[PDB]
Design a protein. Sequence first.
Lengths: 267, 78, 171, 126, 31
Amino acid sequence: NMLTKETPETFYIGKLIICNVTGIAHIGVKTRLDNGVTGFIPTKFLSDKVVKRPEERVKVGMTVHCRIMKIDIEKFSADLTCRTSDLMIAHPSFHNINFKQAEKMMETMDQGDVIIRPSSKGENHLTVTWKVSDGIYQHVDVRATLWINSEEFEDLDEIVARYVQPMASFARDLLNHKYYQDCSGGDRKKLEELLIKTKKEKPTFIPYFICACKELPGKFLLGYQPRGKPRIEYVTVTPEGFRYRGQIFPTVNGLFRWFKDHYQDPV
Amino acid sequence: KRITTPYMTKYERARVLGTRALQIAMCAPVMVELEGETDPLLIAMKELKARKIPIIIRRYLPDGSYEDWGVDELIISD
Amino acid sequence: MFYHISLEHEILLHPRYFGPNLLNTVKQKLFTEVEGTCTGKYGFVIAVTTIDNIGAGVIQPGRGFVLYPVKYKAIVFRPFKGEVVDAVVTQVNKVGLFTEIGPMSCFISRHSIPSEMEFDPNSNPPCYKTMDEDIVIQQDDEIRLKIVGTRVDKNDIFAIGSLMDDYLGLV
Amino acid sequence: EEDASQLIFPKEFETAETLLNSEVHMLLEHRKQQNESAEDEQELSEVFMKTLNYTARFSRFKNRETIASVRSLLLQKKLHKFELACLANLCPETAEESKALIPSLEGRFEDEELQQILDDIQTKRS
Amino acid sequence: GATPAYGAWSPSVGSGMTPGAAGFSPSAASD
């Protein structure tokens, strides 16, 4: 008592006791513990068959934290467990990921499911990626500057249902339009050559279409040919509506009903 | 009622570039896209052309007054 | 005594703290600079209650720091000598009684105690009874006092109380 | 030289705003409320934690009306600012106790005038 | 970062001069 440095009444079963099994006698690693207790590793912790060391130890010996399963510091034994288990419709995903590898997992979900990922530039930042079209995604880099509070971060459920879910419902309506296309992602060279080919079959009736960008997601392309010159008008999709010539429309129908009586000006 | 020159003086240009380049070197947020360069003066120069330097120049008048001028406010020379 | 005054401070900020969170970061730096401190001028400030304004940050020539003269409102605690305060009795000892005036503690010798309030070390609780055991003045009692001398100890106030004045006891 | 008994205060402190013991309690507990109602918040200093209690022990009232009324009934008279707090915390049950405690009240007022200020203060007391 | 501000952008409007007549399509209801 007071000469051994440790008794078996201090070391208990269930608590992790770090064992220093730095040699093996004949299989398992017999080493010393922190309290001077001669740690003789059993088949439940040193695990050596005479053809090898512990494998979960070191490259030149044995050792590590293990779940304490035997109190024999006076008996020159240490039942330390070598195993780590002995010591102990618009869905919302979660994550912790880069940008390139995240692009391959967000192509298989449907339209409306919003993912949750950390940012990449800066600190204490979160990026809201929501599906827009086939290959079009708006990575809302909040501080796409969406200024928020500090109280909201503990509950990640409202920031989507107030800012992205209404935005996704407004973006889905233009996809189900009667005159929609992609032009291989909304390329600017492919869209000017389509308006000049549709005007020849019907010079009296002028058609209109709608498309979005792939490099600048969130901005739609509203092109119209009042005469023999192509012209492109842009529009932004907002969480409360749409931004068209600086006028905010509450519902998706008022934008088109406001455009049908506004494109007849000489500009 | 600012009465001073609406042009960025060569001396302002020198120390604003120098000052901003120092901040850059100290891991400041950049206000411009980096096309893949690393020099703080190169960055500072880029920022200058973009009129994105987050700096205002306090110009002292001889009487004791002063006028503050944003970088985006005054006409960059070079 | 608890007062409200406008104070001022000038703080230094490193370029890593620029960008959209800048003036928020200026507020954070003051809230964790001037709280719970003491001075030989103003005394013991309990907390900064609000920030008045930020003066435009003067960029330091040569070095990348910028300094921000921020004006702010502060609840300050400055005792003066001769003020008559309430306190709680902390420790009853033959060498003297210990009290606590908010962030500042005081001490009362048997010298300042007239001979009525005798010692009680025989009892489990140290008290100051009288001869007849009517007026019981023990630990953890709201006992009034009068600050008869101030002392600042390296940003630390330490006054001294007394019991010479009448009506210095239980309410 | 600095003795509040003879009402001598530094220029930095003369223009100062006096505070009541019950009054500051609302300021401190509201500051506790502001920060503790913030998520992702660092623990407040031991100096904050050790002071909230002091004013709590001496709460003559909590109520936001009585925070004003013991001041208004006093400011109407020709008292010093310094007198404002010492007389509104202690709540001396008579002008006699207050005049014994406070050397500045002695000859300053009628005892019955000062007693009515103190009786108005006692009738504010929770 | 590789992904800068997208929505902080300024949509520039395009000016034109087309003195045409009025022979275009009518409006509809909002329901």
